[PDB]
Write a structure and sequence with these properties.
This is part of a larger assembly, with 1 copy of chain A (49 residues), 2 copies of chain B and 1 copy of chain D (110 residues).
Chain A (H helix, E strand, L loop, with lengths): L1 H9 L17 H11 L11
Chain B lengths: L1 H15 L5 H19 L8
Helix pairs in contact in B: 1-2
Chain D lengths: L1 E7 L4 H15 L5 E5 L8 E2 L2 E2 L10 E6 L5 H6 L4 E4 L14 H9 L1
Antiparallel strand pairs in D: 1-5, 1-6, 2-5, 3-4
The chains are: A mainly alpha (49), B mainly alpha (48), D alpha+beta (110).
The structure holds 3 DNA and RNA strands.
Chain lengths: 49, 48, 195, 110
DNA sequence: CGGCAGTCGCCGTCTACCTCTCCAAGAGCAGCATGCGC
DNA sequence: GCGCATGCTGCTCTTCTTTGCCATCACGGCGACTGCCG
RNA sequence: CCGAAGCUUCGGCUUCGGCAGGAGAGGUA
């Protein structure tokens, strides 16, 4: 959803005929969310061995 | 919390000694008041 | 610029509001730049100038009425010309009947703006009649009109700099004996408020 | 069409101006938002011929825009990628407060 | 004016000790350094 | 041979709060308050 | 305050070097 908001907001400020799917997409929010879940979270717990 | 107050005070001083319109000075004064209030008690009014 | 301590205004109760006799919502609006307040208003000039003031605004209102009836006369002669050029001959008289109805609509439309102007003048007069310190005045346009038409005889602003002025022009003794008089001979809930 | 003041992040004023012009020309609303300008000065910052002028901002963080306030111009202008919000809003912040004739004149003169 | 009842916010909710992990980053503004062109 | 242009790189901040984002928050006691009905 | 090194009259003197906050989860009495 964060990436979708970014692409929707940036689709209206760039010039046409130079718009490609690779120039509208930002990966940072997704990796940030993934690394925030798998790290500082209350449900992904340190294993007891 | 100290740095925020110092930055707002410096911007207010520079804008006052420049001949700024009243609306902008009022906005800066409101923002300085909010910053000091957050310094003394964070979360009492508005959002933390 | 002066600021206000959070402890003495955002408490339960508000010690600043208890000292100044102001609702906490009024304090919050004044402090955070959302409404004006009257710090001081001079009275002797009002008392010795009311007659001239009333004369000036009566003259202005009558001039507005004179302009309005001037437009009425111009539109009346235009409508008379239209009726003369239309009603007398084979031109559609149904159109002129609905034109008469729309003409009545036109008096109503012009009296709308006339009433707007008259109401603005009379409510400015009403506000200037009843103006006391520590009275919050919303609708900033009224403040511009008051501060330009009768800019003297009173002062006020918004922010903590305008509350410092209210605190400085404060008399502890008079309010103290006033509260003690209210408690001595009184009942209901105003006695509870005084307590 | 009265002038209005918009608050943006510090250092993003020129980018906000460019993006707002682009969204004026692209989204479609061209008869609502007319002109934008960032008040600025060109101080004499020089060093032995080698000029070093950093664009002198008289009001850092503010942008001037001429616009007719409908309920869609407020939406398009406020959601530009970089502005924080409108200024001058009083009385529950229903609508922003316009500028003054002489004030706009003197700011647009320099 | 004068009661009046819902409502909304603010206060509080046991002691001592052990082990582990994780704690703003991308964007932006100059300031040059070297390559390329006439 | 000299001037202009663009990328390594010092270098010091900057990070909001609408018509959005945001999703909620026990349980009891207490006290103002505030619109509301009479 | 500790260490290293010199002077040391044996009381000490001189040079250099050096730091310790939050959030979350699980557990024992």
């Amino acid at each position: 959803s964060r990436m979708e908001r970014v692409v929707r907001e940036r689709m209206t400020t760039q010039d046409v005929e130079a718009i490609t799917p690779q120039t509208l997409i930002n990966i940072r929010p997704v990796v940030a969310a993934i690394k925030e879940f798998f790290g500082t979270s209350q449900l992904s717990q340190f294993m007891d061995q | 919390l100290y740095r925020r107050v110092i930055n707002r005070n410096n911007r207010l001083k520079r804008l006052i000694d420049l001949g700024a319109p009243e609306i902008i000075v009022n906005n800066e004064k409101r923002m300085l008041q909010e910053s000091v209030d957050a310094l003394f008690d964070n979360g009492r009014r508005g959002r933390p | 610029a002066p600021v206000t301590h959070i402890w003495y205004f955002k408490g339960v109760p508000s010690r600043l509001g208890y000292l100044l006799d102001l609702a906490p919502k009024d304090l919050e609006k004044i402090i955070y730049f959302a409404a004006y307040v009257i710090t001081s208003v001079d009275e002797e000039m009002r008392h010795n100038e009311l007659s001239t003031l009333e004369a000036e605004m009566a003259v202005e209102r009558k001039a507005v009425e004179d302009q309005r009836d001037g437009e009425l006369e111009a539109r009346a002669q235009k409508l008379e010309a239209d009726l003369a050029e239309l009603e007398a001959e084979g031109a559609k008289a149904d159109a002129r009947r609905k034109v008469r109805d729309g003409g009545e609509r036109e008096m109503r439309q012009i009296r709308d703006r006339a009433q707007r102007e008259l109401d603005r003048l009379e409510d400015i007069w009403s506000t200037f009649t009843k103006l006391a310190p520590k009275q919050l005045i919303v609708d900033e346009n009224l403040y511009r009109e008051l501060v330009d038409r009768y800019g003297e005889y009173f002062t006020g602003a918004m922010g903590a700099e305008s509350i410092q002025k209210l605190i400085e022009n404060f008399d502890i003794d008079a309010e103290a004996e006033s509260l003690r008089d209210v408690i001595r001979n009184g009942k209901g809930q105003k006695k509870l408020r005084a307590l | 069409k009265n002038w209005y003041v918009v608050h943006t992040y510090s250092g993003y004023e020129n980018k906000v101006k460019a993006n707002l012009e682009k969204r004026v020309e692209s989204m479609g609303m061209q008869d609502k938002i007319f002109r934008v300008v960032v008040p600025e000065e060109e101080e004499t910052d020089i060093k032995n011929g080698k000029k070093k002028v950093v664009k002198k901002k008289v009001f850092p963080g503010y942008v001037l825009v001429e616009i007719v306030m409908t309920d869609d111009s407020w939406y398009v202008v406020r959601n530009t990628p970089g502005v924080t919000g409108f200024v001058g809003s009083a009385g529950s912040g229903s609508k922003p407060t316009p500028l003054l004739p002489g004030e706009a004149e003197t700011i647009l003169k320099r």
